[PDB]
Amino acid sequence: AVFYKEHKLRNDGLVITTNQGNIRLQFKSEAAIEVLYRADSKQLPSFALAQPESAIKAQLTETENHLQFSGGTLTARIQKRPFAISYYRDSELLLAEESGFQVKINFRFYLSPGEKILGGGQRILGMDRRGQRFPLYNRAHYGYSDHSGQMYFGLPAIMSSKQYILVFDNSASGAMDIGKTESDILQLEAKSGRSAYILVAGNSYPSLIENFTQVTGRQPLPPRWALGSFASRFGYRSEAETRATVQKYKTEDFPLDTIVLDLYWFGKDIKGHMGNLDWDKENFPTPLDMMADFKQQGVKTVLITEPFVLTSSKRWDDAVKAKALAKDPQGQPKAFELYFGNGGIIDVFSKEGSRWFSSIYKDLSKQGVAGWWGNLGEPEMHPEDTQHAIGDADTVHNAYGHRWAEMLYQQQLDQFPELRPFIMMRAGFVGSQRYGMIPWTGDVSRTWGGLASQVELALQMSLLGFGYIHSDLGGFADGETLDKEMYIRWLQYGVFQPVYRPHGQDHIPSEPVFQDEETKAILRPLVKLRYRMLPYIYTAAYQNTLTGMPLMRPLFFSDEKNPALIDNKTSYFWGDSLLVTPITQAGVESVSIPAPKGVWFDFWKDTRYQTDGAPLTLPTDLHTIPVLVKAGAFMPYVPAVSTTEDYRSDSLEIHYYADASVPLAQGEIFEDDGKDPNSIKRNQFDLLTLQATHTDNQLHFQLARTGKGYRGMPERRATTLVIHNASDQYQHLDINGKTIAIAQADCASTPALACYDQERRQLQLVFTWGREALNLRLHK
Ligand SMILES: O=S1(=O)O[C@@H]2[C@H](O)[C@@H](O)[C@H](O)[C@@H](CO)[C@@H]2O1
Ligand SMILES: O=C([O-])C(=O)[O-]
């Protein structure tokens, strides 16, 4: 039994006093509030908030039985007796406390009937997690397939169909019960740590995510090369083998930006060497030459590092001596048995651990390393009596990887202020995106079920801040012989998800260049397609940096007033315009795609479909997976290159999908130098926009460029605009008032400026796109 006693308004925050203690409410923006219970006491600081000490002016009003604390869109309604806070956007009930806070740490809230709940991060349980209970304790799930209540990267956060996000801003071993134990109760609990939650509201799912990333952090734009092709396996055993793999990509004509080196770079065996963090010179004898030779071919090098230093490693004595390791309660270095052997964990929460670890990254980055892979940051083993500078293992567990990322991000920005850090990690916390974390879904089995779970995993992480969530393409764990069909399907899906990184245990090849002729004839043009689509992908990335909009969006974005779509985890949006339906079983002959009402085109075949609600049945083939294009889409391409180091947009090819049903459409292409962390902030970019206006007798395109440009930017781009489903009635074209006749023959066979292909229903326009506005008008 809890009740209101008294309140103060101080430094813009409302401090309430109950019979059981102090509660501090600070608005972190107009649509986001931090509620800290036990505000009187010493607690761990926030990990989730990008600006933990901010509070914006709010309107407090008092009545008899209630208080009302309001920012712009979000209102906290604080009932006095019994004490219960509830949350409103306008006068719509988002979320009400039941008992609220208790003692362990425990928060309890009501769930409205029919409310659907996404969240928890990586779980394979269904998209609506209501009716489920699971732990908040990051932990490996080696060889998972079609089920998991607990894996590498949990998030103490949910997204509701009421269009709010709730963050349990707590790093400790805990649990989430989403109306499982009691129908109508959401319960959050932890063993220790901060007793705080954060509620964020939105008018729509895009605005919600914008609001969320506003307060938890925005991903800075990764380097363009992160959207390229990675060569990876576990693992290249030598410099010779790694040079041969870069060579194989060249001699097989597959694009390649980055080669990833697994744990054999620092020692000849899986066991016994972890913590060396230095080249195994018997197997990598000339690594500066190696990395420089690769950079001559436009190829970057990424190295795996782990949080553990083994007692058998070259660096044990030094790490002990520097006080870099986490300690036991006696106060000496804590050592424990890992798979790899006996060892300690680097204390990234301490000054001495951070400096020691940072110095090692600095030395290797100076040698040529372009990016970093941080593996096992759950941490994979983490005994409860391990003591970090700010708390014990069970208190800090779910923030270890988060702090590892922050440490490494700050370090890379300090060493290379003109480059974008590349940081790939397995485990983090809410807001780790603000440190550039690129997560992957761990050690997935080489099974169809492993593939069939990846969309669910990607969407759950994308919705809560992680745009670059991806999988080990082809599958990682076990298997004895390649499942060729599953592999092909996985690398096809690969094209339409955030990072193109095939990776697996090296008894079966993960790289597409090591596959048979049929497999390479299928995948080679799709990996080239990935490169041709870089303007589309990089523009989605730019939008993610601006607004948190993820690259993969769920089907439920298409209709916010149909909550039944929340369950779908087989069809998703890649950017604004493509609905992708991966094939997740062997031998599937056709698919039923639940395309939103409107007009859609087969991406591969140009076929036009219209639907008023009913699904579309498409046949399948081995060469592709089913992709529909939304009418009104602008799909931009550039010619395929071997490496994004050679990237050029001097030649653009843009495909517009016309339909009279879409009378107004827009597209955007974001260009910059692909490497500068300050390009957006300083406006050192070239933002191309395209607007189509489609009426009964006219189709009109308005083209423009904004931004201050960048070094090497083309002043003029050769542009081919291909209009799919173009009317055969268009008589003439004006380009900036200059009339041009539309040829009706020989389009593929003449240097035609405007030509209609009657057999394909495509109108092709070729022109020069310079810095000034350009208007193209077609009239009947
Ligand atoms: O248990 S593993 O086989 O899976 C772990 C990682 O998640 C993989 O990405 C990595 O390639 C392996 C070697 O460093 C690790 O051992
Ligand atoms: O829709 C049009 O404009 C047509 O097909 O003629």
PDB file of N, CA, C and O in Angstrom, residues 277-310:
ATOM      1  N   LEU A 277      45.962 -11.014 -28.655  1.00  0.00           N
ATOM      2  CA  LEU A 277      45.639  -9.800 -29.421  1.00  0.00           C
ATOM      3  C   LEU A 277      46.855  -9.320 -30.206  1.00  0.00           C
ATOM      4  O   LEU A 277      47.302  -8.197 -30.084  1.00  0.00           O
ATOM      5  N   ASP A 278      47.434 -10.230 -30.966  1.00  0.00           N
ATOM      6  CA  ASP A 278      48.582  -9.901 -31.751  1.00  0.00           C
ATOM      7  C   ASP A 278      48.801 -11.029 -32.693  1.00  0.00           C
ATOM      8  O   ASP A 278      48.374 -12.135 -32.430  1.00  0.00           O
ATOM      9  N   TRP A 279      49.520 -10.765 -33.771  1.00  0.00           N
ATOM     10  CA  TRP A 279      49.550 -11.690 -34.885  1.00  0.00           C
ATOM     11  C   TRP A 279      50.263 -12.952 -34.525  1.00  0.00           C
ATOM     12  O   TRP A 279      51.346 -12.907 -33.936  1.00  0.00           O
ATOM     13  N   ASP A 280      49.673 -14.081 -34.903  1.00  0.00           N
ATOM     14  CA  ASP A 280      50.386 -15.349 -34.906  1.00  0.00           C
ATOM     15  C   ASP A 280      51.320 -15.297 -36.102  1.00  0.00           C
ATOM     16  O   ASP A 280      50.866 -15.485 -37.234  1.00  0.00           O
ATOM     17  N   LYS A 281      52.613 -15.133 -35.854  1.00  0.00           N
ATOM     18  CA  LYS A 281      53.568 -14.828 -36.919  1.00  0.00           C
ATOM     19  C   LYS A 281      54.056 -16.067 -37.653  1.00  0.00           C
ATOM     20  O   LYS A 281      54.598 -15.947 -38.774  1.00  0.00           O
ATOM     21  N   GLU A 282      53.878 -17.249 -37.056  1.00  0.00           N
ATOM     22  CA  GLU A 282      54.189 -18.499 -37.759  1.00  0.00           C
ATOM     23  C   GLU A 282      53.225 -18.688 -38.944  1.00  0.00           C
ATOM     24  O   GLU A 282      53.613 -19.312 -39.913  1.00  0.00           O
ATOM     25  N   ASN A 283      51.995 -18.170 -38.847  1.00  0.00           N
ATOM     26  CA  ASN A 283      50.939 -18.340 -39.864  1.00  0.00           C
ATOM     27  C   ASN A 283      50.538 -17.055 -40.632  1.00  0.00           C
ATOM     28  O   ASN A 283      50.025 -17.155 -41.750  1.00  0.00           O
ATOM     29  N   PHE A 284      50.764 -15.883 -40.011  1.00  0.00           N
ATOM     30  CA  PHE A 284      50.592 -14.572 -40.593  1.00  0.00           C
ATOM     31  C   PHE A 284      51.930 -13.811 -40.495  1.00  0.00           C
ATOM     32  O   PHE A 284      52.049 -12.848 -39.736  1.00  0.00           O
ATOM     33  N   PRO A 285      52.949 -14.239 -41.278  1.00  0.00           N
ATOM     34  CA  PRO A 285      54.310 -13.672 -41.174  1.00  0.00           C
ATOM     35  C   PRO A 285      54.532 -12.225 -41.602  1.00  0.00           C
ATOM     36  O   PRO A 285      55.476 -11.619 -41.106  1.00  0.00           O
ATOM     37  N   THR A 286      53.709 -11.691 -42.508  1.00  0.00           N
ATOM     38  CA  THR A 286      53.869 -10.321 -43.030  1.00  0.00           C
ATOM     39  C   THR A 286      52.522  -9.617 -43.136  1.00  0.00           C
ATOM     40  O   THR A 286      52.054  -9.321 -44.233  1.00  0.00           O
ATOM     41  N   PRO A 287      51.902  -9.317 -41.997  1.00  0.00           N
ATOM     42  CA  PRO A 287      50.532  -8.841 -42.005  1.00  0.00           C
ATOM     43  C   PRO A 287      50.314  -7.402 -42.381  1.00  0.00           C
ATOM     44  O   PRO A 287      49.214  -7.074 -42.841  1.00  0.00           O
ATOM     45  N   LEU A 288      51.278  -6.524 -42.100  1.00  0.00           N
ATOM     46  CA  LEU A 288      51.208  -5.156 -42.617  1.00  0.00           C
ATOM     47  C   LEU A 288      51.207  -5.162 -44.152  1.00  0.00           C
ATOM     48  O   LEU A 288      50.459  -4.420 -44.768  1.00  0.00           O
ATOM     49  N   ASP A 289      52.054  -5.981 -44.745  1.00  0.00           N
ATOM     50  CA  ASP A 289      52.073  -6.128 -46.193  1.00  0.00           C
ATOM     51  C   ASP A 289      50.738  -6.668 -46.691  1.00  0.00           C
ATOM     52  O   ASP A 289      50.186  -6.177 -47.663  1.00  0.00           O
ATOM     53  N   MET A 290      50.225  -7.674 -45.999  1.00  0.00           N
ATOM     54  CA  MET A 290      48.964  -8.275 -46.347  1.00  0.00           C
ATOM     55  C   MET A 290      47.852  -7.250 -46.369  1.00  0.00           C
ATOM     56  O   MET A 290      47.117  -7.156 -47.345  1.00  0.00           O
ATOM     57  N   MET A 291      47.704  -6.491 -45.301  1.00  0.00           N
ATOM     58  CA  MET A 291      46.612  -5.538 -45.215  1.00  0.00           C
ATOM     59  C   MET A 291      46.771  -4.402 -46.230  1.00  0.00           C
ATOM     60  O   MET A 291      45.772  -3.886 -46.733  1.00  0.00           O
ATOM     61  N   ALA A 292      48.016  -4.002 -46.499  1.00  0.00           N
ATOM     62  CA  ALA A 292      48.305  -2.936 -47.482  1.00  0.00           C
ATOM     63  C   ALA A 292      48.040  -3.452 -48.916  1.00  0.00           C
ATOM     64  O   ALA A 292      47.445  -2.743 -49.698  1.00  0.00           O
ATOM     65  N   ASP A 293      48.506  -4.668 -49.226  1.00  0.00           N
ATOM     66  CA  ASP A 293      48.203  -5.349 -50.494  1.00  0.00           C
ATOM     67  C   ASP A 293      46.707  -5.444 -50.756  1.00  0.00           C
ATOM     68  O   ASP A 293      46.276  -5.177 -51.876  1.00  0.00           O
ATOM     69  N   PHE A 294      45.916  -5.766 -49.723  1.00  0.00           N
ATOM     70  CA  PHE A 294      44.477  -5.781 -49.848  1.00  0.00           C
ATOM     71  C   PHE A 294      43.917  -4.398 -50.095  1.00  0.00           C
ATOM     72  O   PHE A 294      43.040  -4.223 -50.926  1.00  0.00           O
ATOM     73  N   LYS A 295      44.374  -3.414 -49.359  1.00  0.00           N
ATOM     74  CA  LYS A 295      43.904  -2.054 -49.556  1.00  0.00           C
ATOM     75  C   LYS A 295      44.237  -1.538 -51.000  1.00  0.00           C
ATOM     76  O   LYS A 295      43.433  -0.823 -51.583  1.00  0.00           O
ATOM     77  N   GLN A 296      45.368  -1.948 -51.591  1.00  0.00           N
ATOM     78  CA  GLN A 296      45.615  -1.702 -53.029  1.00  0.00           C
ATOM     79  C   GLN A 296      44.498  -2.270 -53.897  1.00  0.00           C
ATOM     80  O   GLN A 296      44.113  -1.659 -54.863  1.00  0.00           O
ATOM     81  N   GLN A 297      43.957  -3.433 -53.555  1.00  0.00           N
ATOM     82  CA  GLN A 297      42.817  -3.953 -54.314  1.00  0.00           C
ATOM     83  C   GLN A 297      41.457  -3.472 -53.790  1.00  0.00           C
ATOM     84  O   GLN A 297      40.442  -4.025 -54.158  1.00  0.00           O
ATOM     85  N   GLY A 298      41.424  -2.439 -52.951  1.00  0.00           N
ATOM     86  CA  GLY A 298      40.141  -1.910 -52.435  1.00  0.00           C
ATOM     87  C   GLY A 298      39.489  -2.789 -51.365  1.00  0.00           C
ATOM     88  O   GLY A 298      38.271  -2.653 -51.088  1.00  0.00           O
ATOM     89  N   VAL A 299      40.296  -3.657 -50.741  1.00  0.00           N
ATOM     90  CA  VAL A 299      39.799  -4.610 -49.764  1.00  0.00           C
ATOM     91  C   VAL A 299      40.291  -4.274 -48.331  1.00  0.00           C
ATOM     92  O   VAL A 299      41.495  -4.205 -48.071  1.00  0.00           O
ATOM     93  N   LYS A 300      39.325  -4.106 -47.436  1.00  0.00           N
ATOM     94  CA  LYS A 300      39.539  -3.839 -45.996  1.00  0.00           C
ATOM     95  C   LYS A 300      39.724  -5.114 -45.187  1.00  0.00           C
ATOM     96  O   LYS A 300      39.293  -6.193 -45.608  1.00  0.00           O
ATOM     97  N   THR A 301      40.394  -4.988 -44.042  1.00  0.00           N
ATOM     98  CA  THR A 301      40.606  -6.108 -43.105  1.00  0.00           C
ATOM     99  C   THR A 301      39.907  -5.826 -41.755  1.00  0.00           C
ATOM    100  O   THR A 301      40.097  -4.753 -41.163  1.00  0.00           O
ATOM    101  N   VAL A 302      39.102  -6.786 -41.300  1.00  0.00           N
ATOM    102  CA  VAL A 302      38.415  -6.749 -39.999  1.00  0.00           C
ATOM    103  C   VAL A 302      38.910  -7.908 -39.124  1.00  0.00           C
ATOM    104  O   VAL A 302      39.120  -9.038 -39.598  1.00  0.00           O
ATOM    105  N   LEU A 303      39.200  -7.601 -37.857  1.00  0.00           N
ATOM    106  CA  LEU A 303      39.724  -8.603 -36.926  1.00  0.00           C
ATOM    107  C   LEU A 303      38.728  -8.827 -35.802  1.00  0.00           C
ATOM    108  O   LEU A 303      38.085  -7.896 -35.344  1.00  0.00           O
ATOM    109  N   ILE A 304      38.600 -10.085 -35.412  1.00  0.00           N
ATOM    110  CA  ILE A 304      37.885 -10.499 -34.217  1.00  0.00           C
ATOM    111  C   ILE A 304      38.749 -10.181 -32.988  1.00  0.00           C
ATOM    112  O   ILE A 304      39.985 -10.344 -32.987  1.00  0.00           O
ATOM    113  N   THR A 305      38.082  -9.667 -31.981  1.00  0.00           N
ATOM    114  CA  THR A 305      38.607  -9.576 -30.627  1.00  0.00           C
ATOM    115  C   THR A 305      37.523 -10.073 -29.660  1.00  0.00           C
ATOM    116  O   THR A 305      36.312 -10.047 -29.991  1.00  0.00           O
ATOM    117  N   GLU A 306      37.974 -10.522 -28.485  1.00  0.00           N
ATOM    118  CA  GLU A 306      37.072 -11.005 -27.412  1.00  0.00           C
ATOM    119  C   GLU A 306      37.378 -10.332 -26.071  1.00  0.00           C
ATOM    120  O   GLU A 306      38.493  -9.787 -25.875  1.00  0.00           O
ATOM    121  N   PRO A 307      36.406 -10.359 -25.137  1.00  0.00           N
ATOM    122  CA  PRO A 307      36.672  -9.734 -23.847  1.00  0.00           C
ATOM    123  C   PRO A 307      37.604 -10.523 -22.899  1.00  0.00           C
ATOM    124  O   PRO A 307      38.037  -9.975 -21.886  1.00  0.00           O
ATOM    125  N   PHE A 308      37.929 -11.765 -23.226  1.00  0.00           N
ATOM    126  CA  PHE A 308      38.646 -12.648 -22.309  1.00  0.00           C
ATOM    127  C   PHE A 308      40.150 -12.671 -22.562  1.00  0.00           C
ATOM    128  O   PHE A 308      40.584 -12.694 -23.700  1.00  0.00           O
ATOM    129  N   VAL A 309      40.935 -12.631 -21.489  1.00  0.00           N
ATOM    130  CA  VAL A 309      42.383 -12.863 -21.547  1.00  0.00           C
ATOM    131  C   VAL A 309      42.714 -14.138 -20.775  1.00  0.00           C
ATOM    132  O   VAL A 309      42.506 -14.201 -19.567  1.00  0.00           O
ATOM    133  N   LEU A 310      43.206 -15.156 -21.467  1.00  0.00           N
ATOM    134  CA  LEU A 310      43.556 -16.411 -20.850  1.00  0.00           C
ATOM    135  C   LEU A 310      44.868 -16.325 -20.081  1.00  0.00           C
ATOM    136  O   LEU A 310      45.783 -15.559 -20.428  1.00  0.00           O
TER     137      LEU A 310
END
